[PDB]
Amino acid sequence: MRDIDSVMRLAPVMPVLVIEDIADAKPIAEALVAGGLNVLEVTLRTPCALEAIKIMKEVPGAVVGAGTVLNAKMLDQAQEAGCEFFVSPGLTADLGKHAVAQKAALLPGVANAADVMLGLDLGLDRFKFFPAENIGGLPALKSMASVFRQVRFCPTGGITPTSAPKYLENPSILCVGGSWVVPAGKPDVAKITALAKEASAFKRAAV
Amino acid sequence: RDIDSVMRLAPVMPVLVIEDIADAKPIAEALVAGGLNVLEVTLRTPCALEAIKIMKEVPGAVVGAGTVLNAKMLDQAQEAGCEFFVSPGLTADLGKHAVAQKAALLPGVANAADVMLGLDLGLDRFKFFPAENIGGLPALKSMASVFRQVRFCPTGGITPTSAPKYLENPSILCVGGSWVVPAGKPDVAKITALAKEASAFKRAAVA
Amino acid sequence: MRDIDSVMRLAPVMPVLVIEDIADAKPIAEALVAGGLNVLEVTLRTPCALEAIKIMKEVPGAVVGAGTVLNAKMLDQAQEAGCEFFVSPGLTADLGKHAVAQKAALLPGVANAADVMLGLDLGLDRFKFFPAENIGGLPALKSMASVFRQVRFCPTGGITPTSAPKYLENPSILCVGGSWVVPAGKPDVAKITALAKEASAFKRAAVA
């Protein structure tokens, strides 16, 4: 299936989903897909997360992945649930070696040059710049992209509707991760779809 | 004792710098009398190993070593009787040595790759260090939101008025602090008064 | 011959060179040496970078190194090109292990305590603080230098002519990395030599 570069190009914004109630999963996936945000990152931060992946996987148009993958075992459990891609807050050689060996579409987080160097040693060149606003923001990413010209990025962490277009004007950025499209209360599918359509319209220099 | 239990004993772990060996016993006595029985003695001073042996004989003191940079320093602190060990950062070498030695290590972390390295080694308790140069409480709040099973001790720039704000987060078990021992000759009544105030800090993690 | 500590002490500023045209390599190296900045870091960020290193090495007095070295094979390629030192944005165990094996004067980037501890475990004690203005600046470097008292640093990343003396007042700092002496665009050899002479006169608490 798709490699992580192809996943990143599909939509300007990758929603970062924290499912506290399993009944929220289907309405959230349907509303995001209705708004054109087809790429869904379900963080493995809650007990029902893997079940939420199995529910969202059956929504037509949804490209479901697992976030907060911390090790090869969690990548395996998420892949067995049907995840098409995997995101991690940071990178280890054991996690990256396992993803390459399994041909899993992994998007590891990086915060500094040594993280990126470990990723390049493993054959990876696509990373989440995370957590963006705690590690110097767009100016820090602009410098890191200047050092690693063959790498492309997905900043995540404190991104907003106001700052997302600024990141997306950089050619080295393919998309951003975002939490604002689904507010942490009970889902409102109309509001979620309207935020998704608004984010769907964001300009991308790289696409 | 394991590091999670050590962190839960008191809201503040004093970070002690003993330059005058004569100060060690009165300081540890005053801190214990004030309810701060967990003592981190930095190894940087020449008399630090001798100070650890004196503090270990104070009843109720739980004495550990700070600024542990490598396996050799850990072995020296363990030979001196330290019950726990604190490092500014984490290496695979120091971590595998602490696990093999059954040493209660509390390694510093600054980013997700540091945490994931520790989790791969079996560690899940970390010092968030240097806290005020890596984004403070807002950055720690995000990191704790990602690593739901990890618990932290922020250290580096913590003050008596900022410490309660960190302690409102249940992922924070305690803070490290330098203010409980004022510079100059020890005033045992003043140290015990500051210690009693710190021992009364409320924390969401421990009733 | 030279270890990385001796390279850092040669001049207050190590220019961070990005060569977009091979024809500019010789004039830039000659202009820098004429201004007294003999230590030249050619970043491996453009395809012609290794070719530019071979050209600059022929300028008398030039001490040529490679920057943005990402792995052990890249260090070997830069060494075969004639580099006398090597700079890396970060540190991996594989890169540091190969550098110590080959006695290569490596200056690896650090941003946090785990980076420094990995370098110390390899026997390294000289690091660039990079990228300085995105990882907390001088206040962050001050705290890190007070943790690792035996380590000495080269801050790089957003250093300016105004801020370089501020960093160079700290005795834990041996030099700074800078881009302002040879910025982007076609070289101005008169401007480069003049900026190199001003950088050469920067006071240093550590070196004198």
From Swiss-Prot, chain A:
Q: Name one GO molecular function term.
A: (R,S)-4-hydroxy-2-oxoglutarate aldolase activity
Which residues of this UniProt protein bind pyruvate? 45, 68, 128
* Family that this chain belongs to: Belongs to the KHG/KDPG aldolase family.
Q: Name one GO cellular component term.
A: cytoplasm
Please state, per the UniProt record, what induces or represses the expression of this protein: The eda gene is monocistronic and is transcribed from a single promoter. High-level expression of the gene can be attributed to very efficient translational initiation caused by the high quality of the ribosome-binding site and stability of the mRNA.
Q: Enumerate the PANTHER family for this protein.
A: 2-DEHYDRO-3-DEOXY-6-PHOSPHOGALACTONATE ALDOLASE-RELATED, 2-KETO-3-DEOXY-6-PHOSPHOGLUCONATE ALDOLASE
Its main subcellular localisation, reduced to a broad class, is cytoplasm
What is this protein's record name? 2-dehydro-3-deoxy-phosphogluconate aldolase
Q: Subunit structure, per the record?
A: Homotrimer.
The lineage's top-level taxon is Bacteria
Pfam families, alphabetized: Aldolase (PF01081)
- UniProt xrefs under InterPro entries: Aldlse_KDPG_KHG, Aldolase_TIM, KDPG/KHG_AS_1, KDPG/KHG_AS_2
Which pathway or pathways does this protein act in? Answer: Carbohydrate acid metabolism; 2-dehydro-3-deoxy-D-gluconate degradation; D-glyceraldehyde 3-phosphate and pyruvate from 2-dehydro-3-deoxy-D-gluconate: step 2/2
Enumerate the subcellular locations listed in this protein's record, separating them with semicolons. Cytoplasm
For this UniProt record, give its keywords in alphabetical order, as a comma-separated list.
Answer: Carbohydrate metabolism, Cytoplasm, Lyase, Schiff base
Q: Where is this site: Plays a major role in determining the stereoselectivity?
A: 156
Which cysteine pairs make disulfide bonds? none
Q: What is its EC number?
A: 4.1.2.14
Q: Which residues form the active site?
A: 41 (proton acceptor), 128 (schiff-base intermediate with substrate)
- Record-linked SUPFAM superfamilies: Aldolase (SSF51569)
